[PDB]
Nucleic acid binder design. Structure first.
Length: 54
DNA sequence: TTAGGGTTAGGG
DNA sequence: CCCTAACCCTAA
């Protein structure tokens, strides 16, 4: 069953993009305790986030 | 391993 | 429901 991204999970992705740049999905995943999220999930979530503008 | 188009299932 | 966010597919 798919799982909605929490606000904490979302905030981790913003700080990861700030600290390491966009496209560095596997580097951002190792910098935060992402449980059950792959680097592709992070890439998809970011595209989702820029559409909703977050 | 990531980018970008495509797929799907669950929540608004 | 059914739209869209969370998924998948794959070239390079």
């Amino acid at each position: 069953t798919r799982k909605m991204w929490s606000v904490q999970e979302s905030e981790w992705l913003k700080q990861g993009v700030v600290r390491y740049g966009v496209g560095h999905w596997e580097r951002i995943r190792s910098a935060f305790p992402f449980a059950g999220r792959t680097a592709v999930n992070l890439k998809d979530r970011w595209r989702t986030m820029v559409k909703l503008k977050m």
